[PDB]
Design a protein around this nucleic acid. Structure first.
Ligand SMILES: [Mg+2]
Ligand SMILES: [Mg+2]
Ligand SMILES: [Mg+2]
Ligand SMILES: [Mg+2]
Ligand SMILES: [Mg+2]
Ligand SMILES: [Mg+2]
Ligand SMILES: [Mg+2]
Ligand SMILES: [Mg+2]
Ligand SMILES: [Mg+2]
Ligand SMILES: [Mg+2]
Ligand SMILES: [Mg+2]
Ligand SMILES: [Mg+2]
Length: 74
RNA sequence: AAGGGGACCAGCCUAAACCGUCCGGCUUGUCCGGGCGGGGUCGUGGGGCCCUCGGACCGAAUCCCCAGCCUAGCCGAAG
């Protein structure tokens, strides 16, 4: 069963990663303990859209910095 | 059971795509979710979106009025 990890998990996976676990593990351990969420379409969208926003918010620095770098060094 | 002969006769509304709006969630957005509104309803497949050409007749199973009918009655030939 596919779930999205809200935490890095020892020898399981990394935060934001989509891993495959047994239904029981997810429902009776991972989910209730806030350690993961079901890889449903609705938050696979949410997962992706946050990856996208972060990549955008990163690029805005590397671009804004580089613009600052243009001023300096000259 | 099909088919044939008859009785009756009538076909519609949604869900989803896409759009709008409100509400709240938090993990801040081009986000997810819940309302509601628009859109859409089909098998010669249909619908959405994007271009591109073209801008009155139908009509309820709802509502209103009316006739007609029911719930009392009345006239009615000639020893
Ligand atoms: Mg028959
Ligand atoms: Mg017949
Ligand atoms: Mg008859
Ligand atoms: Mg017919
Ligand atoms: Mg809000
Ligand atoms: Mg939703
Ligand atoms: Mg929405
Ligand atoms: Mg909505
Ligand atoms: Mg088509
Ligand atoms: Mg109707
Ligand atoms: Mg009499
Ligand atoms: Mg008499």
């Amino acid at each position: 069963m596919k779930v999205i990890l809200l935490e890095p998990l020892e020898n399981l996976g990394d935060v934001g990663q989509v891993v495959d676990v047994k239904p029981g593990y997810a429902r009776n351990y991972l989910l209730p303990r806030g350690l993961a969420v079901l890889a449903t379409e609705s938050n696979l969208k949410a997962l992706e859209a946050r990856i996208r926003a972060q990549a955008k918010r990163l690029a805005e620095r590397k671009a804004e910095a580089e613009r600052l770098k243009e001023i300096l060094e000259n």
